[PDB]
Design a protein around this ligand. Structure first.
Ligand SMILES: *[C@@H]1O[C@H](CO)[C@@H](O)[C@H](O)[C@H]1NC(C)=O
Ligand SMILES: *[C@@H]1O[C@H](CO)[C@@H](O)[C@H](O)[C@H]1NC(C)=O
Lengths: 409, 409
């Protein structure tokens, strides 16, 4: 059969360099293993390589050894074409449902295998897509069920790098889809960022933005340092789990989770990632929170400048925007449930194995009502997704949500 | 000698019923023990007994058994006269430095004893006074040193009911003043509120506001249930400590602390609180945070109404005001120290036994700069006092504080 891949960075902006850095590295890794470019679909906004802030124009690196991963990466879905609708259409393999981009899709055969890697921001039940778009977990599950029902592949492996990424599959990912999944974190942890300005191991001094993400570089640097005809999917999961746990210090690391068909863990990794003919034959990392890396970048910029006050006022606006969202959400909880019960309700985490939300259509509706009244969530606002899900689960009506949002905003 | 007392409620508003309820109960307790009215100075705003919301006009109660404590309480310093300046002047006993009120002061003799009880809101190093006034711990210490240096008393006992009230004395209260102090909480805990609408033990159903404060009713109900010619100061401290710890559950209770001259703990309580001739011869309480009781009261009102939306919009404004203060302070930390270090700096608590702040004049200056730019702190904003103290201790200049406050506000 034929090995296919879909690589997605869900973010843009130079502050988010790392997510397209991850995706570009994954592309070069798969090419080195003998996957063909026509079978690898790359979603990247593509604003990094030639960004005015990039100290190495035309180059993207993904770890402090500084090897370029940008050259040769195809422009399949870039800019405005990096959408959930295009991602869903690529996975289904129906070129007629794609809007824009190259038209490359996963029009795979029943004997083929597929490898999907996503890297950016997220929250409970949701994944980010560039310019304020949100991808809801259940729609992603639905695409996998549809693809499976059309006999489009033999097996699939999915790696997801994002905050709270366990919540995209817990209680909803079927095990009969020949799909195996791992996530950087459990349903409630955040995801961690590595190779940042000011940490060890040191990125090259000219960089003001972080180079990679902990779970992502963990699996990629593990793959490229091993013979993939011998390493199993399970061995990579084990190695990635230990490295991402960062010496089992969950204040500085997270729990890598697995979902779906665990029988796939017995398979050799080359069936999914190819094999590199040259591969024949640790310290605690200083990491930062995915949600904190943006401000660390603006602060790196502030400290290195002389317009110095323009950056500061932009830091002020960013924090103030976050405070507005955090407060609006907290106040909605107060108006709906009272003080002393609003935060318990909004912030309670369901037991592992249960779905985040019982009505996914309600979740989208609460987000819609919120944003109509309180403004756009942004990428940062996905941190409030569990709060909206908990409003849904509480049986509070959409009519009462409307009233609370109008009072709050 | 003669026994004197000063009783202070630092708050006003029907939401804060309990603080004047505490003070009124303490007054009746001391009269029953034979202290004379001319030797007891009462500071209470006096907006409770005849408040339009008071279901028992002319009556104040301090626990669910519903006995009035208001009748007979003198009007020494009420309304606009409840000030730190008047409190300091009362304690010093110089009637000429009082502004307004009755003119009653503690013009005590070297053989006299003094008992001081304060009950309301506070924060690190500060106590509230009605209508946005703040009383700074070191000014209170200075008054005690001045009073001591004039030979004004033999011994003094001080009870303080307020958030973070340990911080008013740690590292600054001398032990050579013949003054013994206990506080409802340590330097970082909040203070707890008892007998609230919706908790057990049940206040009479018509009340929408909490009746008392945990540490305050603990010492008063302990005094009135014992023979004070036999009970020692130490025994009351022990009993109050255990009751305020609420089964040693510090998520629902606090650590009562002691400062000053601990030799006074060996003395019989009647020397300070008098003795009642009739006294010849437990469940975990449901309590709420001092800072949370205001919103619980507005919510009780919301739930019992039909203007129903007027109250809600007032709840919204209260939460939004708090969010503005919390965000402004957090942003000032970000601008001064960077993200990832602003909160560690602003929220770090010094080791027990050290003073909250090294330059008390700087603390007042930071508050001044903040309020000029970001608006009044309010009573709620004393929760940010440790943040301002930590800015002072960090050596950040007043010039840099000004710049950060202008960017932030
Ligand atoms: C994995 O395959 C085994 C066959 O040995 C089967 O018993 C089991 O049900 C399968 N598990 C899943 C999750 O499909
Ligand atoms: C208490 O009095 C004793 C005398 O027995 C003395 O040793 C001690 O220093 C005194 N403590 C304080 C805090 O004044």
């Amino acid at each position: 059969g034929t090995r296919w891949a879909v690589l997605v960075a869900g973010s843009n902006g130079y502050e988010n360099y790392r997510h397209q850095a991850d995706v570009c590295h994954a592309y070069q890794l798969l090419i080195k293993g003998g996957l063909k470019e026509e079978n690898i679909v790359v979603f990247m906004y593509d604003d990094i390589a030639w960004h005015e802030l990039n100290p190495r124009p035309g180059v993207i690196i993904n770890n402090p050894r500084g090897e370029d991963v940008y050259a040769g990466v195809p422009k399949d879905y870039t800019g405005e074409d990096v959408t959930a609708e295009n991602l869903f259409a690529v996975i289904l393999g129906d070129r007629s449902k794609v809007k824009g981009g190259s038209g490359k899709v996963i029009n795979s055969k029943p004997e083929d295998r597929i490898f999907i890697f996503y890297s950016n921001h997220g929250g409970a039940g949701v994944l980010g897509m560039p310019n304020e778009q949100i991808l809801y977990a259940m729609d992603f599950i639905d695409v996998l069920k549809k693809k499976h029902a059309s006999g489009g592949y033999r097996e699939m492996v999915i790696y997801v790098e994002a905050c709270e990424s366990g919540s995209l599959f817990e209680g909803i990912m079927p095990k009969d889809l020949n799909v195996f999944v791992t996530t950087a974190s459990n349903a409630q942890e955040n995801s961690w960022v590595t190779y940042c300005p000011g940490t060890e191991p040191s990125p090259p001094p000219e960089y003001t933005t972080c180079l990679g993400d902990l779970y992502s570089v963990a699996w990629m640097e593990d793959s490229e340092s091993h013979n993939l005809r011998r390493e199993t999917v399970n061995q990579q999961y084990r190695s990635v789990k230990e490295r991402t746990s960062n010496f089992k210090d969950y204040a500085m690391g997270s729990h890598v989770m697995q979902y779906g068909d665990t029988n796939i863990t017995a398979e050799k990794l080359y069936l999914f990632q190819g094999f590199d003919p040259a591969t024949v034959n640790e310290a605690k990392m200083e990491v930062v929170h995915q949600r904190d890396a943006e401000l660390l970048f603006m602060w790196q910029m502030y400290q290195r400048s002389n317009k110095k006050t323009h950056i500061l006022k932009q830091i002020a606006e960013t924090v103030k925007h976050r405070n507005h969202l955090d407060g609006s959400v907290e106040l909605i909880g107060v108006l709906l449930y009272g003080p002393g019960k609003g935060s318990p309700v909004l912030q309670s985490v369901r037991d592992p194995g249960l779905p985040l939300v019982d009505n996914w259509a309600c979740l989208k509706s609460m987000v819609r009502v919120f944003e109509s009244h309180c403004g756009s969530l942004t990428q940062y606002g996905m941190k409030h997704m569990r709060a909206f899900a908990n409003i849904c689960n509480s049986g509070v009506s959409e009519s009462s949500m409307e009233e609370a949002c109008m009072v709050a905003c």
